[PDB]
Design a protein around this ligand. Structure first.
Ligand SMILES: [Zn+2]
Ligand SMILES: [Zn+2]
Ligand SMILES: [Zn+2]
Lengths: 117, 64, 44, 257
């Protein structure tokens, strides 16, 4: 049928794998990650972090078709660094940022158990 | 035919407010006041009650 | 099977190859009774 | 080349909305958590209806639809429920479901309202939000309705009945200090609620080496989760997505040899 079930947008099939690496052959030290069953929520959170690294030359992402569920990320780094390094160093910096913000939040809501005023 | 349970745009719950709207209007509150007292504010949630036609009260006239 | 009159809503079993009329009402429009095998829906 | 130290500051707190402020962070992170309050916060809702006798005015698929959009109290027992596609049981079991039951019959001549006070459950933790009443259908003398429903767990990418929030406000830079938006006549525009300008000014002076900070939020709630556990369950849900993707990645560049 033309209509597609709603769970196909986030639920992985049996043969698929969530992430796939390929090396770009046009320029040195370039790579191209292909995350599966994903969208702008995760795509954009990564790119903004890579640009904050002073050892990354390129970083971007695109959803090749809005009616399929797949994104693509391209990274290029200096010759003394690895794209797979810069990628995993970005993630561990997001996690270190969210878990910190959760502590500061849970403190702020119990900062007014009865009320400050 | 019957008041929807959720505003189409926000998602705020609008279903339980239908009877009250009739009552406030019955009390002679002007419509502008009635909507505010019910607490709807955004003009997407006020369109829900302001432009609703209640057809269910006319299909209860036919004997089952 | 079992049929429902169109005016008095009194169920009456009509046998195969038999005239179509109610009883206690004398009417000639019959509605078949709803099935008893169950079908399930989605709230989606 | 490292993360930031964001700081939160709550302004209001009611049983239906929270107002807070997140300083010292990046725009992409302050938006990626605006889409998680909506889509990826789990919640309980009805997803399986079976009708035994419906002689009302609305057809069967009308009532099966007005039931799913009723919000159920999902406060604490959402973390104990499996996804019905993951659980090792059959189609349904009390480990991944909650069973409801409705049965109404109208006998008096005066019309009858079938509210949500009739949804009778078996688990006293998940009940519709009654502690007015949502209307489901009206009945006439001689009509009846009776059915059975199960309530699964999901989030807002499946269906818009699983998202826990009404409108989610969000905004930053209340005065065009960055000129992200360009007014043709900056005098006809009302001043924002969060602005700090004078009564006779329109925009702050332009500063080129700026950056968006101090985002303002306002999260309402429909009635399932408290407005402060919608936020705590979002940050704890987004963290667990990245943390799972890092597993698949290190599993790939390890199997590279
Ligand atoms: Zn609305
Ligand atoms: Zn008859
Ligand atoms: Zn089960």
């Amino acid at each position: 049928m033309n209509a597609p079930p709603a769970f196909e947008s986030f639920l992985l099939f049996e043969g698929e794998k969530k992430i796939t690496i390929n090396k770009d052959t046009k320029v040195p030290n370039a790579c191209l990650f292909t995350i599966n069953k994903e969208d702008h929520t995760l795509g954009n959170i990564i790119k903004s972090q890579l640009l904050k690294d002073p050892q990354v030359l390129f970083a971007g992402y695109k959803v090749p078709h809005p009616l399929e569920h797949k994104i693509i990320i391209r990274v290029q780094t200096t010759p003394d660094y690895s794209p797979q390094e810069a990628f995993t160093n970005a993630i561990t910096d997001l996690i270190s940022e969210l878990s910190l913000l959760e502590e500061r939040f849970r403190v702020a809501i119990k900062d007014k158990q009865e009320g400050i005023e | 035919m019957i008041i929807p349970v959720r505003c189409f745009t926000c998602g705020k719950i609008v279903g339980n407010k239908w009877e009250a709207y009739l009552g406030l209007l019955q009390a002679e509150y002007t419509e502008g006041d009635a909507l505010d007292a019910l607490g709807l504010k955004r003009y997407c949630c006020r369109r829900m009650l302001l432009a609703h036609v209640d057809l269910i009260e006319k299909l209860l006239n036919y004997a089952p | 099977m079992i049929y429902i009159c169109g005016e008095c809503h009194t169920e009456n079993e009509i046998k195969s190859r038999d005239p179509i009329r109610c009883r206690e009402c004398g009417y000639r429009i019959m509605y078949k009774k709803r099935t008893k095998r169950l079908v399930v829906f989605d709230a989606r | 080349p490292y993360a930031n130290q964001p700081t939160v500051r709550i302004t209001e707190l009611t049983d239906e909305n929270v107002k807070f402020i997140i300083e010292n962070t990046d725009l992409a992170v302050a938006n990626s958590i605006r889409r998680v309050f909506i889509a990826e916060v789990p919640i309980i809702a009805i997803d399986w209806v079976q009708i035994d006798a419906n002689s009302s005015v609305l057809h069967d698929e009308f009532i099966a639809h007005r039931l799913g959009l009723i919000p159920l109290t999902s406060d604490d027992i959402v973390d104990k429920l499996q996804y019905s596609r993951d659980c090792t049981c059959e189609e349904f079991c009390p480990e991944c479901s909650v069973e409801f039951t409705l049965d109404v019959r109208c006998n008096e001549d005066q019309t009858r309202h079938v509210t949500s006070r009739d949804l009778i459950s078996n688990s006293p933790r998940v009940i519709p939000v009654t502690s007015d009443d949502i209307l489901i259908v009206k009945l006439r003398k001689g009509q009846e309705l009776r059915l059975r429903a199960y309530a699964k767990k999901g989030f807002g990418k499946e269906h818009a009945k699983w998202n826990p929030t009404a409108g989610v406000a969000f905004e930053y830079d209340p005065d065009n200090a960055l000129r992200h938006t360009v007014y043709p006549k900056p005098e006809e525009w009302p001043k924002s609620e969060y602005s700090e300008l004078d009564e006779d000014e329109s925009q702050a002076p332009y500063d080129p080496n700026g950056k968006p900070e101090r985002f303002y939020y306002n999260v309402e709630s429909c009635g399932s989760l408290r407005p402060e556990t919608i936020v705590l369950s979002a940050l704890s849900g987004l963290k667990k997505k990245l943390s799972d993707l890092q597993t698949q990645l290190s599993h790939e560049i390890q199997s590279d040899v």
